[PDB]
């Protein structure tokens, strides 16, 4: 589970292991697929 | 959403993330919707699995 | 007995014309063009879609610099960076505090939906269209068979064969640069494989999807990190492959002329009415009947009875047939005035028999040509009120 | 392992190529005048023969057989 | 400094321009259009090859008929026969004499040469051409890249970005129609799949190899063993197929106009030397030299010394360089008169190099350009004597 | 949001509050964004503290 | 921690700037020729559009 630098992770950059990367607002069925720096 | 905001509960802390993304859902179609209806015509859409394999 | 004739191109609609062989009895045609689908010629010239900045994680040299290198990657862009002072989870990490360096680095990259959603472009030639005729023929009643429309192929399927074509309406409705997306066709101006400005339509341009080369303008502008912290500015266009999806023009089979439709198949233009066809069959010789065992029907007389001046068959004629023997009749108006619906009329020994037709002049002056025998069906005909439904059988307007 | 015929006497002339000739074997020999007129050339030739070609100023090709296709400036 | 420049349609020859680029030094091009492969728009119509009456085994009844039925195989040519007397091992077997009953049948099927060796017919369009084509440009002095024709498209492949074409001279060599073979391109008038006359060039017409469909015009014609005896006579013309290999027309590669040479490969049709190209490049502005960094030339004298008056670059001529600085200079005649074999001259502080050039009239008064100095190197010239060998460097007659 | 919603949970009841007031978040810029980014250059907005003191 | 527009595309004509442009919000535009005409202009731009 990888950890990284999330951007507004509350108050303000911190570095959460659920640092979001790769946000993808690209299909249509209400659906996003994104990816944490944390393997769940 | 304008955002994306991201987060589970470990229990002692909300310990959450979250981002900036321009997100949106047209369905595909010629009506520019804001949710997908319980009915209509099926037709083929972009869309992602549920599966691993 | 090659019975040539032009004939119009439209799709839905029988075009009963007659065997005039001289010796045997004639026979109907029933000719359908059921399709037109087009398939011009056509070139994958390069697939786009939207980019990824798919960022290459980036070095951090904790005490002087790291000079980047161009890589090979599409359209790699890499700067290298100082001053920086990199919280990374225990505060920052380098201890110098200048000499901190970080060289961010990243590239352009097929999306995983440029497999499956994305654009594409063609330098589109004419080809050669093609269609599954029916023809109910005569007494065979049946041929559904897919031909072509150059002048010199038969299709030998059923016992008839047919040379259709080649037509005179010329319009391919695609144009010379197409780009195609899923099912709707786009008749584009895409400005070319490894030229799309940023922003604009094909920023990325992929040969194929299995392409790793292309061309990524996407004006991918790396800026430093700001405050001491890991990550990577990528300040970039979104891709002209998202406009081009809610930005874009309107589709082929929705903007079109001369009635055609359209499909993410062959790239076919399907049902485009337009023009003549000149065709020409050669009938099998058995299926004729000979001129002897048909009824000769003259001393007849035909009148209408309630003429409809409509696209419907909804004029009608009574016939006073006058028969010799008693058997079948087909039947066909040589003037394409007059469209009827009855390929084929059955008779006893000289009985009468209504038929449906449809017409555009008032004074429908059609002959009657009742297995080799002329009739004037002279009349007047009244217009319906009725007229929201899909396409005609009358498709014969002239001056009236 | 296939076939090759002789080599040609290439012999100059003013904007013509003299070819004495003398094959094995019947080879077809032909050419294709590099003009937008192509104006070509075909016969086999069993029997030794003294042939003309009138090249022109842009060039002629000259295919003696499989042996492969010549090539030649005749301004 | 977008250089545009029409430029003749020739393979195997540099085009060695000249960047006037107001304000920074010149730079010299070499554009050698090394290939001119086109690969026209095509469509596999039908591959036809020789026939193989391969035979179903006849049937034999022993007393009484056999009535054969159309089975569905191409060709499918069967006929009942009876009055034998089959010997066959033990003398004859059946005990009847003319009630022995023979059943042959024989149907029309691909050889297995159809696969491998094989005519091959198309629709042929005209699609759109390409070149491999080298630049040792300026000081960069190196990028094959292969290209297109169409004007709009770069090709970043070095770091020069080059627009090419479209070329004017249209003259696909290959026709409409047009017969494929091995290697050997014939641009035949194939008649069509579907209707080959028998003995006629596609008297077997499969769609593809895999095809299991096809059109069998044949004529083949089923007789009666002989005398008492089991076999098949199939009386056939021997294909359309076998001949076309030896009483066949000339290859395109032999017979076409405007210098073209053929592959089965893509189909193209490469080095086919007719036209001008309009091509324009953007040249990379680093490559380039300011102005204030070469020598000027100027207060210079030329002159021929020996000009050969022909084709390989015989012309010489001394130049009284006269520089300022010591170093290279790009030369170059816009006259197309004199083609130099020079892109660039090395000079040391006002001296003198011989360059070589051809050219094509008498007098050749033709300005040189060497880096920002005109001249006139008038002078007269000499014929050869020795004219036969591959194509020139010269190509610029005109009135003399 | 058109509104304010306000409220803790005590444990046994909810017991919250809610208001009218106009809120909007425009950032300091000629940007009209909907939404503060994670990047993007700094410039002198207006903002209450984290602070006590 | 604040805004940023997406980089315009500069494109070239004879004194005159076609620019395509894309942003990712509302952007306000807005320029001043520098002549003692000013002759501004302001336009929010959320649609991608090429102006002059």
Same mark, same amino acid.
């Given at each position: 589970?990888?950890?990284?630098?999330?951007?507004?992770?509350?108050?303000?950059?911190?570095?959460?292991?659920?640092?979001?990367?790769?946000?993808?607002?690209?299909?249509?069925?209400?659906?996003?697929?994104?990816?944490?720096?944390?393997?769940? | 959403?304008?955002?994306?905001?991201?987060?589970?509960?470990?229990?002692?802390?909300?310990?959450?993330?979250?981002?900036?993304?321009?997100?949106?859902?047209?369905?595909?179609?010629?009506?520019?919707?804001?949710?997908?209806?319980?009915?209509?015509?099926?037709?083929?859409?972009?869309?992602?699995?549920?599966?691993?394999? | 007995?090659?019975?040539?004739?032009?004939?119009? #191109?439209?799709?839905?609609?029988?075009?009963?014309?007659?065997?005039?062989?001289?010796?045997?009895?004639?026979?109907?045609?029933?000719?359908?063009?059921?399709?037109?689908?087009?398939?011009?010629?056509?070139?994958?010239?390069?697939?786009?879609?939207?980019?990824?900045?798919?960022?290459?994680?980036?070095?951090?040299?904790?005490?002087?610099?790291?000079?980047?290198?161009?890589?090979?990657?599409?359209?790699?862009?890499?700067?290298?960076?100082?001053?920086?002072?990199?919280?990374?989870?225990?505060?920052?990490?380098?201890?110098?505090?200048?000499?901190?360096?970080?060289?961010?680095?990243?590239?352009?990259?097929?999306?995983?939906?440029?497999?499956?959603?994305?654009?594409?472009?063609?330098?589109?030639?004419?080809?050669?269209?093609?269609?599954?005729? #029916?023809?109910?023929?005569?007494?065979?009643?049946?041929?559904?068979?897919?031909?072509?429309?150059?002048?010199?192929?038969?299709?030998?399927?059923?016992?008839?064969?047919?040379?259709? @074509?080649?037509?005179?309406?010329?319009?391919?409705?695609?144009?010379?640069?197409?780009?195609?997306?899923?099912?709707?066709?786009?008749?584009?101006?895409?400005?070319?494989?490894?030229?799309?400005?940023?922003?604009?339509?094909?920023?990325?341009?992929?040969?194929?999807?299995?392409? #790793?080369?292309?061309?990524? #303008?996407?004006?991918?502008?790396?800026?430093?990190?700001?405050?001491?912290?890991?990550?990577?500015?990528?300040?970039?266009?979104?891709?002209?492959?998202? &406009?081009?999806? &809610?930005?874009?023009?309107?589709?082929?089979?929705?903007?079109?002329?001369? @009635?055609?439709?359209?499909?993410?198949?062959?790239? &076919?233009?399907?049902?485009?009415?337009?023009?003549?066809?000149?065709?020409?069959?050669?009938?099998?010789?058995?299926? %004729?009947? &000979?001129?002897?065992?048909?009824?000769?029907?003259?001393?007849?007389?035909?009148?209408?009875?309630?003429?409809?001046?409509?696209?419907?068959?909804?004029?009608?004629?009574?016939?006073?047939?006058?028969?010799?023997?008693?058997?079948?009749?087909?039947?066909?108006?040589?003037?394409?005035?007059?469209?009827?619906?009855?390929?084929?009329?059955?008779?006893?020994?000289?009985?009468? %028999?209504?038929?449906?037709?449809?017409?555009?002049?008032?004074?429908?002056?059609?002959?009657?040509?009742?297995?080799?025998?002329?009739?004037?069906?002279? @009349?007047?005909?009244?217009?319906?009120?009725?007229?929201?439904?899909?396409?005609?059988?009358?498709?014969?307007?002239?001056?009236? | 392992?296939?076939?090759?015929?002789?080599?040609?006497?290439?012999?100059?002339?003013?904007?013509?190529?003299?070819?004495?000739?003398?094959?094995?074997?019947?080879?077809?020999?032909?050419?294709?005048?590099?003009?937008?007129?192509?104006?070509?050339?075909?016969?086999?030739?069993?029997?030794?023969?003294?042939?003309?070609?009138?090249?022109?100023?842009?060039?002629?090709?000259?295919?003696?057989?499989?042996?492969?296709?010549?090539?030649?400036?005749?301004?």
């Amino acid at each position: 589970p990888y950890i990284a630098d999330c951007p507004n992770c509350g108050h303000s950059r911190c570095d959460s292991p659920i640092a979001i990367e790769e946000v993808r607002g690209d299909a249509h069925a209400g659906v996003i697929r994104i990816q944490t720096s944390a393997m769940f | 959403g304008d955002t994306v905001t991201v987060g589970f509960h470990d229990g002692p802390n909300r310990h959450t993330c979250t981002v900036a993304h321009k997100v949106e859902f047209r369905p595909v179609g010629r009506e520019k919707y804001r949710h997908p209806p319980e009915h209509g015509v099926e037709l083929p859409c972009n869309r992602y699995t549920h599966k691993r394999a | 007995y090659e019975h040539t004739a032009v004939m119009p #191109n439209k799709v839905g609609i029988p075009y009963k014309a007659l065997v005039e062989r001289p010796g045997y009895a004639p026979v109907h045609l029933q000719i359908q063009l059921v399709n037109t689908r087009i398939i011009p010629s056509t070139n994958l010239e390069y697939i786009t879609c939207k980019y990824k900045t798919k960022v290459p994680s980036p070095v951090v040299k904790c005490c002087g610099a790291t000079q980047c290198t161009s890589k090979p990657h599409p359209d790699y862009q890499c700067q290298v960076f100082t001053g920086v002072y990199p919280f990374m989870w225990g505060g920052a990490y380098c201890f110098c505090d200048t000499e901190n360096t970080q060289m961010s680095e990243a590239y352009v990259e097929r999306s995983e939906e440029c497999s499956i959603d994305h654009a594409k472009a063609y330098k589109v030639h004419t080809g050669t269209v093609q269609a599954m005729v #029916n023809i109910t023929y005569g007494s065979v009643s049946w041929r559904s068979a897919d031909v072509y429309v150059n002048g010199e192929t038969p299709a030998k399927i059923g016992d008839a064969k047919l040379i259709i @074509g080649p037509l005179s309406s010329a319009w391919s409705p695609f144009d010379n640069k197409v780009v195609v997306y899923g099912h709707e066709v786009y008749n584009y101006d895409f400005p070319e494989y490894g030229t799309g400005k940023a922003g604009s339509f094909g920023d990325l341009q992929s040969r194929t999807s299995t392409s #790793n080369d292309l061309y990524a #303008n996407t004006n991918l502008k790396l800026q430093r990190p700001q405050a001491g912290i890991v990550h990577t500015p990528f300040t970039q266009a979104p891709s002209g492959f998202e &406009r081009w999806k &809610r930005d874009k023009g309107a589709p082929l089979n929705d903007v079109a002329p001369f @009635g055609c439709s359209i499909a993410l198949e062959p790239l &076919r233009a399907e049902n485009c009415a337009v023009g003549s066809i000149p065709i020409s069959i050669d009938i099998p010789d058995a299926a %004729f009947t &000979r001129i002897s065992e048909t009824p000769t029907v003259s001393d007849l007389e035909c009148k209408i009875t309630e003429c409809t001046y409509a696209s419907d068959f909804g004029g009608i004629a009574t016939v006073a047939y006058k028969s010799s023997k008693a058997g079948n009749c087909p039947i066909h108006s040589p003037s394409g005035v007059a469209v009827i619906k009855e390929n084929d009329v059955t008779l006893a020994e000289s009985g009468s %028999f209504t038929f449906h037709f449809s017409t555009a002049n008032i004074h429908p002056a059609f002959k009657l040509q009742v297995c080799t025998s002329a009739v004037t069906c002279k @009349g007047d005909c009244k217009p319906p009120k009725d007229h929201i439904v899909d396409y005609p059988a009358q498709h014969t307007e002239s001056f009236t | 392992i296939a076939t090759l015929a002789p080599e040609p006497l290439v012999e100059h002339k003013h904007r013509t190529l003299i070819l004495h000739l003398h094959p094995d074997h019947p080879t077809l020999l032909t050419t294709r005048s590099l003009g937008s007129d192509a104006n070509p050339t075909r016969q086999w030739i069993e029997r030794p023969t003294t042939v003309n070609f009138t090249v022109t100023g842009e060039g002629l090709e000259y295919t003696w057989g499989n042996h492969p296709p010549k090539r030649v400036w005749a301004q």
